[PDB]
Each structure stands twice: as structure tokens, then as C-alpha cells.
Paper text:
Recent research has identified the Mpr1/Pad1 N-terminal (MPN) domain-containing protein ([name]) as a sensor protein that may recognize DNA 6mA modification in eukaryotes. Moreover, the Mpr1/Pad1 N-terminal (MPN) domain-containing protein ([name]) was the first reported protein containing the RAMA domain to directly bind to DNA with the 6mA modification in vitro. Our results revealed that [name] possesses multiple functions, such as binding DNA and interacting with histones.
The final apo–[name] structure in the space group P212121 was refined to 2.06 Å resolution, with an Rwork of 23.0% and an Rfree of 24.9%. In the final structural model, the asymmetric unit contained two protein protomers, each with three helices (α1–α3), two long antiparallel β-strands (β1–β2), and four short β-strands (β3–β6). According to the SDS-PAGE of crystals, the key reason the N-terminal structure could not be resolved was due to the conformational flexibility during crystallization rather than due to protein degradation. The two protomers possessed virtually identical spatial arrangements, as revealed by structural superposition, with an overall root-mean-square deviation (RMSD) of 1.0 Å for all Cα atoms. The main structural differences between the two protein protomers were in the irregular loops, particularly in the N-terminal location. Two [name] molecules were present in the asymmetric unit of the apo–[name] structure, but their interaction was weak. Interestingly, the structural analysis suggested two possible dimer configurations: dimer 1, which possessed an interface area of 439 Å2; and dimer 2, which was generated from the symmetry and possessed an interface area of 411 Å2. Therefore, the oligomeric state of apo–[name] in the solution is mainly monomeric.
Numbering used by the authors: 62 to 130, 134 to 156
Amino acid sequence: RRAVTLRVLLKDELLEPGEGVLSIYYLGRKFTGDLQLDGRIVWQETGQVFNSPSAWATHCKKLVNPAKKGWASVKYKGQKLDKYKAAWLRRH
């Protein structure tokens, strides 16, 4: 499951790269991300580059709730990334 990265999903065209195609909603705050062809995420607000959905999600949620502490929270065009991981496995 961990093996199935954004890089892998992009290569087999489960996902397309693009600006503002990734989103997180957490306790009232919306976060928007650009998906690069290399599978890295650009947080639009600061331009900070993250290596994984989990890395971006943990950073964004800690700003809202420092107690908190990826694939379930991060959405690609309104669908959870977990749905694309599962879809890759079912496609092989």
C-alpha cells in the first residue's frame, strides 16, 4: 500500500499533475496544493514543497491544532487519495 505513491499514480495516469488539484479541509480551514509531475505537493499559501500527502497534511493540521500528531484527509478533485490508491491495486 505504502509502495503506491503519487509518483506511481501519475506514471500509470490514475492522477494528472496540475495547480490547486489537491485540497485538505480541517476544523474550518481549507488548504490547496499543486501536484507536480515528480509527485511532490506545493502548498499554494506559502509555496512550501512537501514530499508526500502525509507530510503536507501533518504540517497543515498542526497549524490549526498543534496537538494533532494523509491519504484519508487529502482529496484530488473532490475524491480522497485513498480511493485512487485502492483503484491502482484493483487495476494492478
